[PDB]
């Protein structure tokens, strides 16, 4: 029903064809099998005659008649084979492609049609709900979506089941039994692919926890990266992310190690039941002979049918996924539920007028529960006469126009237009009665003269030129080039506000209609352009019956009559004159008014060499991989082999050939195999293991290290960095797992594939490379061609779609009307382009896909073909033929392993590229020397002599300029400026986070440009507005080891005691030993604060530093923490440029800075009996 009928609908010699394809997609999955069907005969002949070609030691010219004249017959079998079944799978195969366009397009395009169609025909309801755009965004996604759904993909569909069902309808009846057998192996094979999913899963989450911690680490200490470095925290931190680094490299080794643990085995129990089909194959052979090993083969063959049901799954996945999301939806999509509009039929009015009728109109706008903006209206406007209406509260009256456009049918009561009920006229008529100004004017993208023309389809430039010249719109017009002509680009905004609703109004007069609507169309403009559109209306008025509705009452005055709302409850009515002496609503209004990334520059080869550098020894994992990559081959060989003595041998010594070859297919894989997997795993897993440390470790320790705009002023983010972490370390990491899997693969086809190469005939080769890099390069310019061709399509689709998306944005074209169709008339034409491409690449996929399978049977037929025949001809050899098979598996291991990691080493070199810009740094500031911190240094005397500065954003204008203070040691230097900074950065260029652009700055007369960094940071009293605690025991947060400072419990003691925090000391559990409880969250800030002040003289720094402490704090706190303070300083110097004016009174030194400038200085008194700036504060205090 609603599930499929529709997803196929129409099309009726679509269906036709549709089923025809069908049929053809069955004989194509037919026809696999029945080519292995052939390859179980030509087997089963030359089986017999290589019984009698061993046989011999006796004749030998006999072994020339017949056995040559069978292969000869078989030579006149494999002629009529390839032929018949690739002309047959050449054929086919253009024609189920054909069944993924040719019924498609004709659907899409129909789809596109009705559903373009059906979104304007919804009209109102869009308005009413939904995205709007969202929705029309996925929408459009969606019907790209069944495409894919009615495809070739149900073409492969079929065919997968006529390779499935078709493929184990002739295993059964050739026998019973070795199907049970694969059967079996079925779950195993599943058993062990489960044992994937729950290593994969887990192992991952153990890893996301792990990092978290690593991952937390850089998440705060990034974002408290001042705090850490004016304290020099760093070296902690350092070791830290180490340790957490360490767990989650050994959870990244055992993934590793299980992993491959399961990889290996997963392989081992596919060949193991391998081997188990064959020694069960065979044994019904040698002493039963039943099977010449044709069905052996074949019932191989039901592992390639079964695998086609693995192919078969995505196909219907792509269809089941496509038809559930688009039937549910083409409810929506298609139809039209309209009944509110429509666009056809009802009452056409000849009667060419109609006084506007308002009766009992009880309203509510389909939000729903929102309560009724209209109750009740009564409202008759005479015609001729142009009524105003008027509010408050907002809308309400903008209902009542909207009504009138009958785009929302009333709850209760009824719009009267002449004498006849509104909804009795046809709809498409009426908005041609109806002309409209919106307060906000829109143009399409399109020339002044279409966007005219989008009002009238038949109309000429003089109606045009009379239009704009009756609107006033002649004048901008003509002096703008292009003149009509001219576009409007970049979506409508270009020019003048004023001059677009100009022309709106002249689109709307070209209109003629009996009746005009003014919403607001004065409303938010500029005064003076206001007045020129002004007249155009007044111009446009008076002539035409009309209601305007503005909160301009400038364009009231001369109105015939007024009535007021509000909130849209109709009370007053009348002329202006008689509602002022009502003095009422309207009267009392009057006198009121009056995050990406990955920069471009790339690595090099400069990856390897860095890797490399940090990868000490690894030449066991490789070599490793190396023995495992000529591994690969042997199965090939012993397996060749295995048949091979099997066809061409004798009866005699067949049971011992045969055992001794299936343990040696067993052992040479089953034991080695998963060694050497394992071995491998166990090397380069643990080699990506400790990479992702060295990297993670020398970046962060690298980005610890610089500071100067990356930290202090970036364009990035915290996550951003964490970013950075991730993924870098975890690319290059499949940056050097691709690195074995390639070399591993590299010796299994290249080396050892050559070494058997070489055993040919050298001519069997040539052929052979005259097919698989032919067929290879044939299957790599479709790739392209298709990409072209999907790359092509969606720049066609893409002008419809945005002209598309230009219009259903639009709601107001369906106030006009004229372009409903008119719109769908241009994706018509715009959709037109598409559907003959679309029945271009009919063509052009239906060539490709059969061209891809005619090298199909070519390669078997020269396979065959050149393997009998000349050969067939002269020494006939049960070798060098299966070792052409051999070669083949080799080239599908080569292809598919190797794409797959090619990506891979894709992003990860752009990963690996960013990582390493970023580590060379700029280490700037970390030890060197520069001074040798002079006992006599201790001091505290502050200077700043011309000193100018701007955080790192160039044109900025800073906010230092020649600026100088001075403080002597032991005393408080206070600070006040008007807001912002200049406080704040002064405190900030005393840690030295930015050497200003001039001047010098000193402490002991010494100069800081010139001083050592860390002994700098080393004595600071630094205390934020809102201290920012790690989250660690207080005690190890209230000292924070500056050097060599241990945790002193007697001294944490004495930073309490001062603090004032010890008072939560003395009591709660744990005491000092408490946690802060996950970032301080059972503490509020006048806690937190006196722990900063703890963390400050604990350093006993001869230099205090206060910003804004007590900014965020209330009631005691306030009084405590300045208890506190004044007991912090006054035993060194201080600088508080704390916002409170109240606790400044005590100061040595209080001083007024203007933006740069400082203005004033003194003591309090001294500066109260100044005036300026300072008193300012004081007296704006209050």
Same mark, same amino acid.
């Given at each position: 029903?609603?599930?499929?009928?529709?997803?196929?609908?129409?099309?009726?010699?679509?269906?036709?064809?549709?089923?025809?394809?069908?049929?053809?997609?069955?004989?194509?999955?037919?026809?696999?099998?029945?080519?292995?069907?052939?390859?179980?005969?030509?087997?089963?002949?030359?089986?017999?005659?290589?019984?009698?070609?061993?046989?011999?030691?006796?004749?030998?010219?006999?072994?020339?008649?017949?056995?040559?004249?069978?292969?000869?017959?078989?030579?006149?079998?494999?002629?009529?084979?390839?032929?018949?079944?690739?002309?047959?799978?050449?054929?086919?195969?253009?024609?189920?492609?054909?069944?993924?366009?040719?019924?498609?397009?004709?659907?899409?395009?129909?789809?596109?049609?009705?559903?373009?169609?059906?979104?304007?025909?919804?009209?109102?309801?869009?308005?009413?709900?939904?995205?709007?755009?969202?929705?029309?965004?996925?929408?459009?996604?969606?019907?790209?979506?069944?495409?894919?759904?009615?495809?070739?993909?149900?073409?492969?569909?079929?065919?997968?089941?006529?390779?499935?069902?078709?493929?184990?309808?002739?295993?059964?009846?050739?026998?019973?039994?070795?199907?049970?057998?694969?059967?079996?192996?079925?779950?195993?094979?599943?058993?062990?692919?489960?044992?994937?999913?729950?290593?994969?899963?887990?192992?991952?989450?153990?890893?996301?926890?792990?990092?978290?911690?690593?991952?937390?680490?850089?998440?705060?200490?990034?974002?408290?990266?001042?705090?850490?470095?004016?304290?020099?925290?760093?070296?902690?931190?350092?070791?830290?992310?180490?340790?957490?680094?360490?767990?989650?490299?050994?959870?990244?080794?055992?993934?590793?190690?299980?992993?491959?643990?399961?990889?290996?085995?997963?392989?081992?129990?596919?060949?193991?039941?391998?081997?188990?089909?064959?020694?069960?194959?065979?044994?019904?052979?040698?002493?039963?002979?039943?099977?010449?090993?044709?069905?052996?083969?074949?019932?191989?063959?039901?592992?390639?049918?079964?695998?086609?049901?693995?192919?078969?799954?995505?196909?219907?996945?792509?269809?089941?996924?496509?038809?559930?999301?688009?039937?549910?939806?083409?409810?929506?999509?298609?139809?039209?539920?309209?009944?509110?509009?429509?666009?056809?039929?009802?009452?056409?009015?000849?009667?060419?007028?109609?006084?506007?009728?308002?009766?009992?109109?009880?309203?509510?706008?389909?939000?729903?529960?929102?309560?009724?903006?209209?109750?009740?209206?009564?409202?008759?406007?005479?015609?001729?006469?142009?009524?105003?209406?008027?509010?408050?509260?907002?809308?309400?009256?903008?209902?009542?126009?909207?009504?009138?456009?009958?785009?929302?049918?009333?709850?209760?009561?009824?719009?009267?237009?002449?004498?006849?009920?509104?909804?009795?006229?046809?709809?498409?008529?009426?908005?041609?009665?109806?002309?409209?100004?919106?307060?906000?004017?829109?143009?399409?993208?399109?020339?002044?003269?279409?966007?005219?023309?989008?009002?009238?389809?038949?109309?000429?430039?003089?109606?045009?030129?009379?239009?704009?010249?009756?609107?006033?719109?002649?004048?901008?017009?003509?002096?703008?080039?292009?003149?009509?002509?001219?576009?409007?680009?970049?979506?409508?905004?270009?020019?003048?506000?004023?001059?677009?609703?100009?022309?709106?109004?002249?689109?709307?007069?070209?209109?003629?209609?009996?009746?005009?609507?003014?919403?607001?169309?004065?409303?938010?403009?500029?005064?003076?352009?206001?007045?020129?559109?002004?007249?155009?209306?007044?111009?446009?008025?008076?002539?035409?019956?009309?209601?305007?509705?503005?909160?301009?009452?400038?364009?009231?005055?001369?109105?015939?009559?007024?009535?007021?709302?509000?909130?849209?409850?109709?009370?007053?009515?009348?002329?202006?004159?008689?509602?002022?002496?009502?003095?009422?609503?309207?009267?009392?209004?009057?006198?009121?008014?009056?995050?990406?990334?990955?920069?471009?520059?790339?690595?090099?080869?400069?990856?390897?060499?860095?890797?490399?550098?940090?990868?000490?020894?690894? /030449? +066991? !994992?490789? #070599?490793?991989?190396?023995?495992?990559?000529?591994? &690969?081959?042997?199965? @090939?060989?012993? $397996? =060749?082999? /295995? +048949? !091979?003595? #099997?066809?061409?041998?004798?009866?005699?010594?067949? &049971?011992?050939?045969? @055992?001794?070859? $299936? =343990?040696?297919?067993?052992?040479?894989?089953?034991?080695?195999?998963?060694?050497?997997?394992?071995?491998?795993?166990?090397?380069?897993?643990?080699?990506?293991?400790?990479?992702?440390?060295?990297?993670?470790?020398?970046?962060?320790?690298?980005?610890?290290?610089?500071?100067?705009?990356?930290?202090?002023?970036?364009?990035?983010?915290?996550?951003?960095?964490?970013?950075?972490?991730?993924?870098?370390?975890?690319?290059?990491?499949?940056?050097?797992?691709?690195?074995?899997?390639?070399?591993?693969?590299?010796?299994?086809?290249?080396?050892?594939?050559?070494?058997?190469?070489?055993?040919?005939?050298?001519?069997?080769?040539?052929?052979?490379?005259?097919?698989?890099?032919?067929?290879?390069?044939?299957?790599?310019?479709?790739?392209?061609?298709?990409?072209?061709?999907?790359?092509?399509?969606?720049?066609?689709?893409?002008?419809?779609?945005?002209?598309?998306?230009?219009?259903?944005?639009?709601?107001?074209?369906?106030?006009?009307?004229?372009?409903?169709?008119?719109?769908?008339?241009?994706?018509?034409?715009?959709?037109?382009?598409?559907?003959?491409?679309?029945?271009?690449?009919?063509?052009?996929?239906?060539?490709?896909?059969?061209?891809?399978?005619?090298?199909?049977?070519?390669?078997?037929?020269?396979?065959?073909?050149?393997?009998?025949?000349?050969?067939?001809?002269?020494?006939?050899?049960?070798?060098?033929?299966?070792?052409?098979?051999?070669?083949?598996?080799?080239?599908?291991?080569?292809?598919?392993?190797?794409?797959?990691?090619?990506?891979?080493?894709?992003?990860?070199?752009?990963?690996?590229?960013?990582?390493?810009?970023?580590?060379?740094?700029?280490?700037?500031?970390?030890?060197?020397?520069?001074?040798?911190?002079?006992?006599?240094?201790?001091?505290?005397?502050?200077?700043?002599?011309?000193?100018?500065?701007?955080?790192?954003?160039?044109?900025?204008?800073?906010?230092?300029?020649?600026?100088?203070?001075?403080?002597?040691?032991?005393?408080?230097?206070?600070?006040?400026?008007?807001?912002?900074?200049?406080?704040?950065?002064?405190?900030?260029?005393?840690?030295?986070?930015?050497?200003?652009?001039?001047?010098?700055?000193?402490?002991?007369?010494?100069?800081?440009?010139?001083?050592?960094?860390?002994?700098?940071?080393?004595?600071?009293?630094?205390?934020?507005?809102?201290?920012?605690?790690?989250?660690?025991?207080?005690?190890?947060?209230?000292?924070?080891?500056?050097?060599?400072?241990?945790?002193?419990?007697?001294?944490?003691?004495?930073?309490?005691?001062?603090?004032?925090?010890?008072?939560?000391?003395?009591?709660?559990?744990?005491?000092?030993?408490?946690?802060?409880?996950?970032?301080?969250?059972?503490?509020?800030?006048?806690?937190?604060?006196?722990?900063?002040?703890?963390?400050?003289?604990?350093?006993?720094?001869?230099?205090?530093?206060?910003?804004?402490?007590?900014?965020?704090?209330?009631?005691?706190?306030?009084?405590?923490?300045?208890?506190?303070?004044?007991?912090?300083?006054?035993?060194?110097?201080?600088?508080?440029?704390?916002?409170?004016?109240?606790?400044?009174?005590?100061?040595?030194?209080?001083?007024?800075?203007?933006?740069?400038?400082?203005?004033?200085?003194?003591?309090?008194?001294?500066?109260?009996?100044?005036?300026?700036?300072?008193?300012?504060?004081?007296?704006?205090?209050?």
């Amino acid at each position: 029903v609603s599930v499929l009928t529709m997803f196929r609908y129409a099309g009726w010699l679509d269906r036709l064809y549709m089923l025809v394809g069908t049929l053809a997609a069955i004989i194509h999955g037919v026809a696999l099998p029945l080519m292995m069907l052939i390859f179980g005969d030509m087997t089963d002949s030359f089986a017999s005659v290589g019984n009698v070609s061993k046989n011999s030691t006796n004749m030998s010219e006999a072994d020339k008649r017949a056995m040559f004249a069978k292969l000869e017959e078989e030579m006149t079998t494999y002629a009529y084979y390839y032929t018949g079944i690739g002309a047959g799978v050449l054929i086919v195969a253009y024609i189920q492609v054909s069944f993924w366009c040719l019924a498609a397009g004709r659907q899409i395009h129909k789809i596109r049609q009705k559903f373009f169609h059906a979104i304007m025909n919804q009209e109102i309801g869009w308005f009413d709900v939904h995205d709007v755009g969202e929705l029309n965004t996925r929408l459009t996604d969606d019907v790209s979506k069944i495409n894919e759904g009615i495809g070739d993909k149900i073409g492969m569909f079929f065919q997968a089941m006529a390779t499935f069902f078709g493929g184990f309808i002739i295993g059964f009846t050739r026998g019973w039994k070795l199907t049970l057998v694969i059967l079996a192996i079925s779950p195993v094979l599943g058993l062990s692919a489960g044992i994937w999913a729950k290593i994969l899963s887990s192992f991952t989450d153990k890893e996301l926890h792990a990092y978290a911690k690593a991952g937390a680490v850089a998440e705060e200490v990034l974002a408290a990266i001042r705090t850490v470095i004016a304290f020099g925290g760093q070296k902690k931190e350092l070791e830290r992310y180490n340790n957490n680094l360490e767990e989650a490299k050994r959870l990244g080794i055992k993934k590793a190690i299980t992993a491959n643990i399961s990889m290996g085995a997963a392989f081992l129990l596919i060949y193991a039941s391998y081997a188990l089909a064959f020694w069960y194959g065979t044994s019904l052979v040698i002493s039963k002979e039943y099977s010449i090993g044709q069905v052996l083969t074949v019932f191989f063959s039901v592992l390639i049918g079964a695998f086609s049901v693995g192919q078969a799954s995505p196909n219907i996945e792509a269809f089941a996924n496509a038809r559930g999301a688009a039937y549910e939806v083409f409810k929506i999509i298609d139809n039209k539920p309209s009944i509110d509009s429509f666009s056809k039929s009802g009452h056409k009015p000849d009667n060419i007028q109609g006084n506007l009728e308002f009766k009992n109109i009880h309203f509510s706008y389909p939000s729903r529960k929102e309560v009724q903006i209209l109750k009740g209206l009564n409202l008759k406007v005479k015609s001729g006469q142009t009524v105003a209406l008027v509010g408050n509260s907002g809308c309400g009256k903008s209902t009542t126009v909207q009504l009138m456009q009958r785009l929302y049918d009333p709850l209760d009561g009824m719009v009267s237009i002449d004498g006849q009920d509104i909804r009795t006229i046809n709809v498409r008529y009426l908005r041609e009665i109806i002309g409209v100004v919106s307060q906000e004017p829109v143009l399409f993208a399109t020339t002044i003269a279409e966007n005219i023309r989008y009002g009238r389809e038949d109309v000429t430039m003089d109606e045009i030129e009379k239009a704009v010249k009756e609107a006033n719109a002649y004048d901008f017009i003509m002096k703008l080039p292009h003149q009509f002509d001219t576009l409007v680009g970049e979506r409508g905004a270009q020019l003048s506000g004023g001059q677009k609703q100009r022309i709106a109004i002249a689109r709307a007069l070209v209109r003629n209609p009996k009746i005009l609507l003014l919403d607001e169309a004065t409303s938010a403009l500029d005064t003076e352009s206001e007045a020129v559109v002004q007249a155009a209306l007044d111009k446009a008025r008076e002539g035409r019956t009309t209601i305007v509705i503005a909160h301009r009452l400038s364009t009231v005055r001369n109105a015939d009559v007024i009535a007021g709302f509000d909130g849209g409850v109709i009370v007053e009515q009348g002329n202006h004159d008689e509602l002022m002496r009502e003095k009422g609503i309207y009267f009392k209004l009057v006198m009121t008014q009056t995050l990406d990334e990955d920069v471009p520059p790339a690595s090099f080869w400069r990856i390897l060499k860095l890797n490399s550098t940090e990868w000490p020894y690894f /030449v +066991v !994992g490789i #070599f490793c991989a190396i023995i495992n990559g000529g591994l &690969q081959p042997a199965f @090939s060989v012993i $397996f =060749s082999k /295995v +048949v !091979g003595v #099997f066809t061409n041998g004798g009866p005699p010594e067949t &049971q011992r050939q045969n @055992s001794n070859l $299936f =343990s040696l297919l067993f052992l040479i894989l089953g034991i080695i195999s998963f060694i050497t997997f394992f071995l491998q795993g166990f090397t380069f897993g643990k080699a990506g293991e400790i990479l992702t440390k060295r990297l993670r470790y020398m970046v962060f320790k690298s980005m610890l290290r610089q500071d100067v705009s990356w930290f202090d002023d970036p364009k990035n983010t915290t996550g951003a960095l964490t970013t950075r972490l991730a993924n870098d370390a975890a690319q290059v990491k499949g940056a050097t797992g691709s690195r074995l899997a390639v070399i591993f693969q590299n010796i299994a086809n290249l080396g050892t594939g050559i070494i058997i190469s070489l055993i040919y005939g050298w001519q069997l080769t040539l052929l052979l490379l005259a097919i698989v890099p032919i067929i290879a390069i044939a299957g790599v310019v479709e790739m392209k061609m298709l990409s072209g061709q999907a790359l092509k399509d969606k720049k066609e689709l893409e002008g419809s779609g945005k002209i598309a998306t230009e219009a259903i944005e639009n709601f107001r074209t369906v106030v006009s009307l004229t372009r409903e169709q008119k719109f769908e008339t241009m994706y018509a034409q715009s959709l037109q382009i598409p559907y003959r491409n679309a029945m271009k690449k009919a063509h052009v996929f239906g060539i490709t896909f059969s061209f891809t399978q005619a090298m199909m049977y070519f390669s078997y037929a020269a396979c065959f073909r050149f393997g009998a025949y000349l050969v067939t001809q002269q020494l006939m050899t049960f070798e060098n033929v299966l070792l052409v098979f051999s070669a083949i598996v080799f080239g599908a291991m080569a292809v598919g392993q190797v794409s797959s990691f090619a990506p891979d080493y894709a992003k990860a070199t752009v990963s690996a590229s960013h990582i390493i810009r970023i580590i060379e740094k700029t280490p700037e500031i970390d030890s060197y020397s520069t001074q040798g911190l002079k006992p006599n240094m201790l001091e505290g005397n502050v200077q700043f002599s011309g000193v100018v500065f701007n955080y790192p954003t160039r044109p900025s204008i800073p906010v230092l300029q020649g600026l100088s203070l001075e403080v002597k040691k032991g005393q408080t230097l206070a600070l006040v400026g008007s807001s912002g900074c200049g406080k704040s950065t002064v405190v900030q260029l005393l840690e030295r986070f930015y050497d200003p652009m001039a001047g010098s700055v000193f402490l002991d007369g010494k100069e800081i440009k010139q001083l050592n960094v860390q002994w700098l940071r080393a004595q600071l009293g630094i205390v934020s507005q809102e201290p920012i605690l790690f989250d660690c025991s207080i005690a190890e947060n209230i000292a924070y080891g500056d050097n060599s400072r241990v945790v002193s419990y007697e001294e944490i003691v004495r930073a309490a005691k001062e603090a004032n925090i010890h008072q939560f000391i003395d009591s709660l559990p744990d005491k000092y030993n408490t946690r802060v409880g996950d970032k301080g969250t059972q503490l509020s800030g006048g806690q937190k604060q006196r722990i900063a002040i703890a963390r400050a003289l604990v350093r006993q720094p001869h230099i205090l530093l206060l910003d804004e402490a007590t900014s965020a704090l209330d009631t005691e706190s306030e009084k405590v923490v300045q208890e506190a303070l004044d007991k912090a300083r006054e035993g060194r110097t201080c600088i508080v440029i704390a916002h409170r004016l109240s606790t400044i009174q005590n100061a040595d030194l209080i001083v007024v800075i203007q933006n740069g400038k400082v203005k004033e200085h003194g003591t309090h008194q001294q500066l109260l009996a100044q005036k300026g700036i300072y008193f300012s504060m004081v007296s704006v205090q209050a």
